[PDB]
Nucleic acid binder design. Sequence first.
DNA 1: GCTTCATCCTG
DNA 2: CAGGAGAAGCC
Length: 252
Amino acid sequence: PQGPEIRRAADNLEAAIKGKPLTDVWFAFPQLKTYQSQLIGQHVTHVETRGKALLTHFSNDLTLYSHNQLYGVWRVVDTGEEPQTTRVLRVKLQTADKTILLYSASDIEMLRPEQLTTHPFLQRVGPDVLDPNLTPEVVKERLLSPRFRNRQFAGLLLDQAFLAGLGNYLRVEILWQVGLTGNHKAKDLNAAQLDALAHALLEIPRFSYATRGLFRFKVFHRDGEPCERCGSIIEKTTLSSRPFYWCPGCQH
DNA sequence: GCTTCATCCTG
DNA sequence: CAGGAGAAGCC
Ligand SMILES: [Zn+2]
């Protein structure tokens, strides 16, 4: 899962317990046990995202950080209820009625103010595609800036240092959107393809966020399926040490 | 890249 | 049941 799916969950989280006094806190990691009693009686002032990184802030200026990587997922149940699964619960934040549960995730750390600009991941990430103030123009400048100008999209479109919230499926989809493969570079592009790439880089991820579960897959998990644009045979290969879906007669 | 820690589902 | 599907670590 990526930014789109991470913001949708964050919101579900805010919709369930934000502003609500926590009647209980629980963590799997012993190291975090110390913040439990500490958090009881406090409340989430706001849950923030910055890519696939999840920051759940508290009234006492503490912030719960977490990355779902590829297995962590958030649940939202009614207090006292715990649907079953083999997943390993990692965090419990409960209030009178609503409760949220985090399973699987392994990157769960508690930050005080300072680490919010010091954490290993937080320090690294670039603008958020879901971030409003982030405009195509800015994103367009960044593509041409000297820090990314000479980098292939196959790898760049995955690098959080460039843009937070983009993952693989968004990787294949965005490039298919503008008819490109992962072997190009911002510098090897005309003004019409950069501006295109630019928007797709923000619009698509958003469209996914706003509509995924309208948004549908156009090349992800579609090997053997017919390209909807030209109709060529979409092949599955490996790009960036991960699966890459694309159209042979649609991407150059 | 490449190699590795780290969960969970098909397959 | 081995593979396989977001990042940091080391050349
Ligand atoms: Zn095509």
